[PDB]
């Protein structure tokens, strides 16, 4: 029997909301078909953006979206992306086209459709000072000038707003295989001549270390700490090794486990992180952002290794539950995070073909813990039970955030796929008494996922075995499943 | 009672006329107004550029300009000041006009209707090494290429001559954040595509240290002192904190004893600086330049702050004097100083208002100290009293220079604003008996200044107070006052 | 009698042919009636390629050729060489013109004529990453795209391959005056957006040391190795001083002795530069190339300095000889090895004047020696007789390679000028007893060369001073004498 204790006055802190964010790249399908359709497709579509899908992420709260990030950041031109579609740059070869069809107008349309904040990783290893100097005009500049009557020419009046610009992305690998100490200057030197035009306000971001890369940390709040707002983090869960990582459905019991662990260690990255930051940044103005998180499997049966489609089971789910639960620990630092990828592409929250979509086990995750965009995050701690071949693993992963509304909700994780998890919750700091809800998500299956043949096999059913006895909330969770509760007062 | 001794004989060194520079960057109304009219302006204009100033500069010897310089150099992109006027880049935005009427052939149009030097500074924050290289090409190149023959397009037949080119400015700050270790290798690049064309000789120019900045110096003559020519120095007198720097007028006697101190600690920078360079150059072969050098305050009040509009009083022309004395002090090593800036920017020395223009204080140090340039450098030392709250500047900057005449002209400045200051002189290594005539430069107020209303409230009178008994020349200098004297033998 | 052993049976590695590659700039007449005359040229061309050349070079059996390398590699920018050769860019000076009638198109032609490997610097220097990215893009990519439809555009419809592909060239001097850890940076950064096309595989090459710059070896290895397929190596045999290097005719014996060891000493950096790579590579996956090699003297008089006329006397045969013979020494590393320069410069093979041209001493060295391209290199060791002014350089050099075909070649030079040198050579691992003919390239004069006048003054005579009693082979070499055999079974 795991066992919880909750202090609803003391106030941690507050989970920035953009923290339930995600990432799109000209990648696979994840722009084309998964968003970008063309006006005159045949399905559903605002202004070339399909429908089916626009209404189920303005119903999930996307806070922020990260484009077109990863390697192609550091590969596209944005002027091949603006201008008369018809006289946008094209590009295919045949073993994967590129029409461009989808660049900055359409982008800025989406994040309005939707309602998200935009954020954007100029070029920086292929790309030059001025040309991404430029993009910043094209984009938020209110006057006269070569790039802002080339905006409005292409039919955009007035300038968008936009906060977040990524200065390059994966510079260490694919985006310029650069040492530390190098991209350092680089940084300093492009971000100088980037300016808030009107009185739109940038928000810089250097790209920061991948996985255990402590040494670019280091260095790169030492050189250029004073001219950024935030710092990128990449971490991918890959069950195996690289050359055969495993699938999305189909696994063993080993492969379950394997993957959670893995998952779990990104705490472990983000706290020795936070500690180089932590010195170098005493006062914690810099954000810490995690633009590049998630499950890897080898790709589905058949499709194009480089296409990346990959499934989506309840696996997936509990994974997003947990990881969100450790930004959650280190909300303090942490103000961003964004999945990998939205659409068509690894660990996606959503999945198309054709007209016919479907949410994954991950999207209900993002769905059912949205309440805690932007909530209070409340003091607690625990006596969670063991689980896995080892007790390796922590069975029960718990959080509470209070939303403006007073309202208190709780998430919190079945790790044993094997068997359901008794908790105890005690309740601190309380003025009236309370009732509270419940709902569940969690699968018959350790590999349960949702076909295009069967949409629904894994999804939010309200949740009932759990008894409130004012002031002790026992109740046994399902196995392998994911919770929120949420509670009133009164 | 103050003493000084003149070894009419040894010569210490000569002042390099360069020393009397100045500065103008695309800014305020330094450009535009201060200069360019435009050919169809009212104002009485040579090919666009006003007459009214033209004269004074001429009559005030001008040798050396420094454009577009500052921080408008490592974003100008000079293409964008070529070609047809009208069909030149355009920007306006108002939180300021930038049509680029004023570009490349104006200028050096200008440099010679003055007969000064021209010294540029390439764009290497935001330009590309083939940019500044091709500038190169299109100015000094006598042969056929596409930026030879688009010169001549553009209405210059021959190629123009230019010695002094800047690799960047401010690439500390404003010109890309650079760390110095980082600049030395970009300034080594750049500079290995700029060629002497024709019979062309370039003299290049690396953007050294601001203020104390011993680090960027030292590392700059390890790194790259090979391929450079001279290195430039910016330090600022600035009576306040930065961010409350003080008025140009109606400031307190505090303010007065301020600016003068902040102004003489140059002196300690140039040694220090000098030092670095001594060590890394024992033969002195590379220039230091100084093309960032003035006072400068809050801004008018009323007038745009980055409008930089700020007045020019008699504590102004103080700083000016015994800054051009430092650098006499300093000539073995300095060979070329820009006051910023020339015209309705910081310590001008012309301001305008419409086709009305008035020359400052600084105005007449410039013209009375002329006398100066290139002239020779005579061994003195002195016995200066002491002035200020705490014994704590000295009363009277002195320095003599020997013109190619023979005759010999002996600049000072009383610093005590509160009462004349006595001088006696002794002459050595003369043969034949000497006569004198003197100008002094003085005010009534301690902020005497020149406006458009009474455009002569601060000007050269010429000066008797001295009596010259063959071998002691005794005078009484008034307060506040620069004076400058002419001796001839015989 | 200096004596030999050869262990036919014992291979040591394999001469790779591209040992045999050679160098062309856009310099003096390199390319221009070197090799393009037009095709309106009176002078017999090949789609404006000279015929009389042509024919030489494929006789000669060229492997690779590097273009347009040297300074000029680090300031072409590759758009300037395609599209209509009338819209080509141009330029000229009067002291010398430049019209890219020679770009990349008609590279690819040239070496598809001769059937060499094509060899190209991008200009890293004065060039974009997104500039040289894309030369790889219009040459070598099969799909749809603005640079491979201008490339087809442009007359050649399916893409060419190409192996080698150097970043940059003398990037310590006129290439950017960089200081190797800095150039690593650069390198690792372009070389990232050089993609494999279709099937195409790149063999990137980074710019090495110039000369005992071992320092650069060092970086450029820590820093890069990972990211580089080889790396270059500069070495010129001049015989003075810069300033003073000597003519390449009428010449004392001091120059003589001086020239030889000055060439011999190449074998020390190769052997210290190995043992650096050997380190940081033991697996010696990286190629040593040796794209600048050669000797060097002052032109001839009269012609332009900078044209780089220069003769070519059987003293560069020599040179070439024992160079070849220091490079197959070191086989197991070298791989490439490209002498500077091809015509009208530097040590040339061939030389022009209007429709005559003539075939070096150096020529007929490397037509002579061909027979070991991609022949088995064979175990030896030598009793070598002395030579030079103090016993200083050995008597005789001396290779042997099994071509293909099971026949046996043996390649000797002697040093001395003065007397013929006694040679014995026992032979082991033979199966038949064996035939030999026998070809040598001598001169009657120290600086014995071919004129336009006299083009046949040098050139390979047969030769048979050697008795082949079967086991011992007694042969006595002329005075400085390059010498090869052909040795059959049975």
Redesign the interface.
Not at 141 to 146: A, Q, R
Not at 174 to 179: D, P, V
């Given at each position: 029997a795991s066992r919880v204790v909750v202090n609803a006055d003391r106030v941690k802190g507050t989970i920035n909301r953009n923290i339930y964010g995600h990432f799109s790249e000209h990648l696979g399908r994840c722009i084309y078909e998964g968003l970008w359709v063309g006006e005159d497709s045949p399905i559903p579509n605002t202004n070339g953006i399909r429908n089916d899908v626009l209404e189920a992420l303005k119903q999930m709260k996307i806070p922020v979206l990260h484009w077109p990030g990863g390697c192609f950041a550091d590969?596209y031109?944005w002027k091949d992306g603006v201008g008369p579609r018809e006289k946008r740059?094209?590009?295919?070869?045949?073993?994967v086209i590129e029409n461009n069809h989808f660049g900055t107008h359409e982008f800025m349309m989406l994040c309005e459709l939707l309602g998200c904040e935009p954020y954007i990783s100029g070029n920086v290893?292929?790309?030059?000072?001025?040309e991404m100097?430029e993009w910043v005009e094209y984009i938020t500049?209110?006057?006269?000038?070569?790039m802002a009557n080339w905006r409005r020419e292409n039919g955009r009046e007035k300038p968008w707003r936009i906060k977040y610009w990524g200065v390059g992305n994966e510079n260490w690998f694919?985006?310029?295989?650069?040492?530390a100490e190098?991209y350092a200057?680089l940084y300093?030197?492009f971000?100088?001549?980037l300016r808030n035009?009107?009185d739109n306000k940038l928000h810089k971001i250097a790209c920061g270390a991948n996985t255990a890369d402590y040494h670019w940390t280091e260095v790169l709040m030492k050189?250029a700490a004073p001219?950024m707002h935030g710092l990128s983090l990449h971490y991918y869960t890959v069950p195996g090794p690289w050359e055969k990582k495993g699938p999305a459905t189909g696994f063993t019991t080993d492969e379950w486990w394997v993957t959670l662990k893995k998952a779990l260690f990104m705490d472990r990255l983000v706290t020795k992180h936070s500690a180089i930051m932590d010195v170098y940044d005493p006062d914690k103005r810099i954000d810490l952002i995690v633009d590049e998180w998630g499950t890897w499997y080898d790709v589905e049966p058949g499709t194009n290794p480089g296409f990346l489609y990959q499934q989506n089971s309840i696996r997936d789910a509990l994974v997003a539950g947990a990881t969100l639960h450790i930004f959650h620990r280190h909300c303090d630092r942490v103000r961003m995070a964004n999945i990998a990828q939205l659409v068509n592409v690894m660990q996606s929250v959503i999945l198309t073909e054709g007209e016919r979509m479907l949410l994954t086990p991950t999207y209900h995750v993002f769905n059912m813990f949205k309440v805690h965009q932007d909530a209070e995050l409340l003091d607690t701690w625990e006596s969670v039970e063991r689980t896995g071949p080892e007790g390796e693993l922590p069975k029960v992963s718990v959080s509470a955030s209070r939303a403006a509304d007073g309202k208190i909700h709780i998430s919190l994780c079945n790790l044993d796929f094997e068997t359901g998890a008794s908790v105890d919750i005690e309740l601190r700091g309380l003025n009236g008494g309370v009732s509270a809800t419940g709902t569940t998500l969690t699968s018959g299956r350790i590999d349960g996922h949702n076909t295009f043949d069967e949409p629904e096999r894994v999804k939010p059913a309200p949740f009932r075995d759990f008894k409130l006895e004012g002031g002790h909330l026992n109740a046994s969770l399902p196995p392998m499943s994911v919770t929120v509760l949420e509670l009133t007062a009164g």
């Open positions: 590969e031109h740059k094209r590009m295919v070869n045949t073993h290893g292929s790309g030059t000072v001025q100097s500049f209110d006057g006269e000038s070569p694919c985006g310029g295989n650069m040492r190098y200057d300093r030197q971000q100088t001549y035009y009107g050189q001219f």
